[PDB]
Amino acid sequence: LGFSFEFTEQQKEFQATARKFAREEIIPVAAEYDKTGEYPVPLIRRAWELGLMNTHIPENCGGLGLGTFDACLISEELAYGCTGVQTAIEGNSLGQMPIIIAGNDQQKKKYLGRMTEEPLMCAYCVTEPGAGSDVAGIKTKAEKKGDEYIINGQKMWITNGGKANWYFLLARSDPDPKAPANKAFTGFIVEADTPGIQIGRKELNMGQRCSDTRGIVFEDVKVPKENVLIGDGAGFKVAMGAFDKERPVVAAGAVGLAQRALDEATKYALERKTFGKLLVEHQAISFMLAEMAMKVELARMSYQRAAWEVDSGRRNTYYASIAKAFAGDIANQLATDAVQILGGNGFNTEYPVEKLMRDAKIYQIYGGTSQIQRLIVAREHIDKYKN
Amino acid sequence: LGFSFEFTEQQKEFQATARKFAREEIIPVAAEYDKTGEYPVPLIRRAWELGLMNTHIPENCGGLGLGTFDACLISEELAYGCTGVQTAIEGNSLGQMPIIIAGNDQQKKKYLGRMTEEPLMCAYCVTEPGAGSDVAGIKTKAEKKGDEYIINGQKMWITNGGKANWYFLLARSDPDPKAPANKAFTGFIVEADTPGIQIGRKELNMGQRCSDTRGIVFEDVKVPKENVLIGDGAGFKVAMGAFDKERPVVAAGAVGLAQRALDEATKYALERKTFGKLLVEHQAISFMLAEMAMKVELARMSYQRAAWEVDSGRRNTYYASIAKAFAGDIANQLATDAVQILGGNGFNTEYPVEKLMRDAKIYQIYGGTSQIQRLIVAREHIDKYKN
Amino acid sequence: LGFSFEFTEQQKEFQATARKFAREEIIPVAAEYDKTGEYPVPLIRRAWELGLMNTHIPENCGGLGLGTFDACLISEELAYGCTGVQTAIEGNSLGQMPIIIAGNDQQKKKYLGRMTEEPLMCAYCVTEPGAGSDVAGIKTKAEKKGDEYIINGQKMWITNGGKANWYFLLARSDPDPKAPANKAFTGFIVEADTPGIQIGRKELNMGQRCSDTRGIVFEDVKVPKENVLIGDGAGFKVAMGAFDKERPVVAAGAVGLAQRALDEATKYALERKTFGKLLVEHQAISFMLAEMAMKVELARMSYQRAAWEVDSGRRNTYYASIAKAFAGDIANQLATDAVQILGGNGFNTEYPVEKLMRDAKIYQIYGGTSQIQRLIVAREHIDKYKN
Amino acid sequence: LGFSFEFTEQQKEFQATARKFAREEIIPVAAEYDKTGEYPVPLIRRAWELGLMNTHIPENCGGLGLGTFDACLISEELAYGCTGVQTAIEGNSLGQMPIIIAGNDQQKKKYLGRMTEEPLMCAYCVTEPGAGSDVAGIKTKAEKKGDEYIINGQKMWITNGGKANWYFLLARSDPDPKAPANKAFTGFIVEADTPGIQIGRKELNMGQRCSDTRGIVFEDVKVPKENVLIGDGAGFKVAMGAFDKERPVVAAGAVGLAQRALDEATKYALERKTFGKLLVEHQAISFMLAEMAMKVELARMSYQRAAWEVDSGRRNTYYASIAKAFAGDIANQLATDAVQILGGNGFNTEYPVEKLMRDAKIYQIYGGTSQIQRLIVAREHIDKYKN
């Protein structure tokens, strides 16, 4: 019934709550956590109490039953403070996503119910050292032996890997190398305390240092037949489904980071003065902030559209990819320009802009790299012109 | 409620009409009109009687009483067929805008009222050989002489110049050089058949060759005091506001040209075959096609935002300039990439793309060049950090 | 032995000759030939006598013996005035290259010599309506029936195609659809007079409108066994080698057009004033002219190096393709920025810049489009890493 | 006379020496020094004995008395191994550039002589917390007290400051602010152990972390008369001269980093397989690599040109600025793309590319930011038309 760019009073309150938290509780300690690299437990507990965590969990499982548009709205406020921290919080939504859209009443009740009861964490296990962008190439095995599957393999770059209470695991169940991807993998929910799960050490990355990233080995892990999501073989579609519903929020985190660098650079441009004039008075630096503004705004509407698409019951693969490709890219651009506007100071650890550049980079790599995001769009676009 | 990216049933119906028209009536003749540079009188008459023109004219004066959002929607379809014809049609909305926003009852009934009676044209006269972006630097003057104003000066690049029934004229009334912009100009309605007016020849340009662009000389043009819009000195304000309402629409025209270039490039990539596979099979071209869809999609959302903003009673200055700046630029990008994908044929005059590349260019020039758009966004952005 | 960026006295002379011809004779008439499209016969003749045309022909064949470097510094000076004229004149060298790098004395003074006696033109008939970038996709058949070769096929986009005394024709002789490039095409030298040949009409293009571009059908044309170049299955090596000699030159013409673009804009920026000051005194404009100067500077050095390789006796395919890709692109970027700097005037036909924008486009298509250049560089690059 | 793109045999030697050293001694340890931020003394001392360190010191002072071109050649190689080490090594040559181009032989033998005897380091003190780019805005005072000057001020971001034996210091003598830049500053040479000098704590930056970077306070530091550079008041053109002479070697550094990023990414691309192909076989990846190559090759030529010009006895301002702006820009474009190509591994500390991304940023800042370089290029450009 007409276009609208106005939030509901409910969404307005969520954003307020998320914003207050990011500024008063996240920003002050963001650097601390980035230097040390320690899991931000206090901030995660707090976000959990304010209800800015596990917003997709259904109401009948003690959750808020919020949609994607809502999750994006909160995520961007959270990223503004620190994407290293928000990635941890978001790891939960991603790891629990495949259950929200495909698990049954009993699975949802058990694995989603515990998340609402106490600040538990969960992860998403799909990537492997040999296959990331190419999901169809993951080799972690899952042998149907009796009333349990025996999982065997090595997963890599898992967010919340060594902090998860349980995992969503994508494994190959069909041993025939000619088996279609849409019938060869199975989704399992495996409790982290199962004997045979060897959690590796914390990986030292360039940015998002406080986020927990690890590799895991699954040496003859036994999973009950009840933890299979839809059935043997349905794993691929559940994975690709979770991604579609999550890309808008990953696009939202990047916009938050971009917005942070824009605010930082602008505030400095108003304080610094060279060649007798304020930085903001040099036509070049004003064009820079101008273009930086255009980018954050455009990227924002990108995910707002993509999020709306999913919430309206429409297929959003196309829009969500535009959002992820665009937002991820401009986040990186704005981060670099932010440190540039800050001169020697921006390259220094005493300033916040330097860290954003480091954090920005993964927005072009995880969640489907910029290259696969363009493949998707080109695919959803061209198909419109065929028959 | 919250966000919505859905048209109303009446908007979908406008879109359908404009689409059918551009598809069946404009596209077929677009090439001939660009070649001959002949004013598309027939197409303008059809659009007029289809109700796809003079959409802002209030219903109390015979118009439809539509808003900017609706104008944008119709305009993107018209531009898809030909931006030359669309520009001709948009000149009217630009000429009538100062009257719709600042005219009194008697002025609207008289000057708008007849646009409803016949397919008449009008123009927006403010640019000059010495001034375009710097509106405050125009030198055409108006001397109060009894019950008349005697205008003296020359305007340049007036779209629908020697085709208008009447004009909107911005002229300087305060002779004092150091007088402020907000009180030195006056906006008049000048009937075409007034004696001192001398229309120039058709200006031959590179793009939108069938639109009537030309300069005009006013040598002791007497204008009734009745014809001043708000009053002596209120001219600058009326012009700056007219630009705000019309910018999202000129941006909408840039998206139309862009979508045309995309359709053409895509249709050809699904048919031309190089190195044993369709162009769409070569990842480079697929990536090319991807970013093209990406750009146009984000551009469309930017003009929709700027249009919604104003209809809701907001100062849309910030969103309108982002729209016009972005859309103006992506239109040129898509246009050049479209001919590129068509190779040697793309450069040939018998193919629809070269004309798109030529038309696109003014989108960064008129209605506020790409530079002054960034100038505005910077201005609008910095204020929010000053206090 | 030691880097040197200086020309030899002889070269410095050639440059000043081509320059005066360009700026005193070509420039005052470039506009007219663009508007009419008619072949600049006079300009081509005047250039012949000055020695600017057919520079590569050997001293023994009456020619001057100029190397590639010299051809480049001459082409750039000509193209500065008009890429249209420069292209027709350049069609000669291109059509001669195959006979120069792979012909025998007899063939040499038969074909090059005449070219020394009269201002005759030649063409390089390689591309076809169905195959442009994919040389191996060439379908023009050539069968050896006794002491001769009967040839049937069609060409498309041949410069000097209907003004050529003799042509260079590449055609497949090995019917076997799996005949390697290597051993599947034969290069000939077929004079325009041989019955069976038929020049199509003149193609109207968006730019370099005075240049002669037409298609040629070869409907049962016989070529004497002697007018074959190096033999059977020799044709492919020849064309690639020719290309390889000319890419630097097309890159030179492109750099020529860009210099003209940067000159016009800079001069306009030093006269036009907006908001009190000259255009140049606005940072966004100075920064524009600066990057326009950078782009051109780098492009010039790129072609000079590509030219040096071939002359130094070294292969140049890597630097060649780096040179044409960069040069062809920047030429387009400069041309459009120049139009922008001139504002409304730049978009008008009474101003020089507009033509440059229409001309520049082919510098990204003919002589190996921007995509295959990227493909050639990539392969030349990757190659030196594996083993 | 004649263009030449080939080093002399001597230069080839230097290249090989700097190459073997960087790739066999710097590379294997650059990772450690990066993490630890420890001054690479072993590496610096070794460079010193290899004869790659004070390459500009005139023979009569024990030095090799090499020119800029040779310095660029050597620097690009040291940088390939690591720009943190290279910077410390480069800090000396920058710091002794004024003495070289302004010192009287008595000062020369004393200061440039030490360097020839022991690995002595030096620094270039010009930037201060209040100004870096706006050089003429420095506030460190120099006060004449007979045959000596008393300095008071504070510098910031000094390379090798805290490790330098002596400092080249630019301070403002004339207190009359209405005094021109060309007669307001005086350059000095000061023993690093003079009372009043308070070296600050090492700064923790994002890039070239083993490179030493500190601030310094001059609290009543006494400087003898004979330690002034051309005369009192000539210090502004002396600093500006050194800049023009060093800029190309800063560009060479960037290019070194770009080659590293290029090789590092091409090698990975030749082994990493996704979707059953090597990354190199995915057209979008090879196109990426082709453009990475293009940028490096051009950036190399720009610094060679700039370096030649200076060694040719002519002003290189225009080309030096074209070189530093371009090289610094693309070095970052390659650094980021190198990370992209290695994907998840690229963002991880276990791989080389990440460090390159953190190092590359400074090249757009120090040695004159990307903004000021363009001001210079534009300045030199419009000037060629001004007359």
Ligand SMILES: Cc1cc2nc3c(=O)[nH]c(=O)nc-3n(C[C@H](O)[C@H](O)[C@H](O)COP(=O)(O)OP(=O)(O)OC[C@H]3O[C@@H](n4cnc5c(N)ncnc54)[C@H](O)[C@@H]3O)c2cc1C
């Ligand atoms: C910090 C971090 C956290 C992560 N967290 C998670 C997590 O919680 N859960 C999870 O399951 N995964 C996670 N990942 C993995 C992440 O999603 C993958 O890194 C990403 O999908 C890229 O995969 P890769 O590194 O294997 O890239 P590769 O596939 O090796 O690709 C390398 C390069 O080649 C390009 N390329 C590959 N295929 C093509 C093609 N067809 N066409 C063109 N270019 C191509 C890629 O775009 C990239 O540029 C995380 C990664 C990181 C670094």
Ligand SMILES: Cc1cc2nc3c(=O)[nH]c(=O)nc-3n(C[C@H](O)[C@H](O)[C@H](O)COP(=O)(O)OP(=O)(O)OC[C@H]3O[C@@H](n4cnc5c(N)ncnc54)[C@H](O)[C@@H]3O)c2cc1C
């Ligand atoms: C086909 C066509 C139709 C038009 N129709 C109309 C119409 O109906 N009515 C009407 O009134 N006008 C019309 N115009 C005129 C158009 O509005 C002006 O050309 C435009 O707004 C300003 O361009 P100019 O020629 O005045 O350029 P200039 O103001 O001279 O500017 C030239 C260049 O310098 C840049 N520049 C200028 N000032 C600055 C600055 N402060 N900082 C940085 N960069 C700057 C500009 O962006 C541009 O790139 C039309 C023009 C064309 C070509």
Ligand SMILES: Cc1cc2nc3c(=O)[nH]c(=O)nc-3n(C[C@H](O)[C@H](O)[C@H](O)COP(=O)(O)OP(=O)(O)OC[C@H]3O[C@@H](n4cnc5c(N)ncnc54)[C@H](O)[C@@H]3O)c2cc1C
């Ligand atoms: C005025 C003019 C004069 C010319 N004069 C001559 C002449 O004298 N002699 C002559 O032989 N030719 C000449 N040509 C032809 C010109 O060289 C070809 O147009 C050009 O080589 C491209 O071929 P195409 O036009 O068939 O385009 P196509 O090969 O159809 O390609 C179309 C698009 O697909 C892209 N593409 C193709 N293959 C790939 C791939 N594998 N990966 C990615 N992208 C790809 C191309 O880059 C282009 O963007 C001329 C052309 C013009 C317009």
Ligand SMILES: Cc1cc2nc3c(=O)[nH]c(=O)nc-3n(C[C@H](O)[C@H](O)[C@H](O)COP(=O)(O)OP(=O)(O)OC[C@H]3O[C@@H](n4cnc5c(N)ncnc54)[C@H](O)[C@@H]3O)c2cc1C
């Ligand atoms: C690691 C490191 C090492 C260094 N080593 C040395 C050394 O040995 N010796 C030394 O003396 N200095 C050194 N410096 C300092 C260096 O020269 C300055 O950082 C640099 O010139 C930038 O000055 P600034 O940082 O004060 O930035 P500012 O002058 O504050 O400028 C900040 C930003 O605004 C932009 N800007 C400013 N004015 C304009 C304008 N007019 N137009 C457009 N954009 C503008 C700048 O380009 C930059 O993007 C070093 C710095 C670093 C970080």
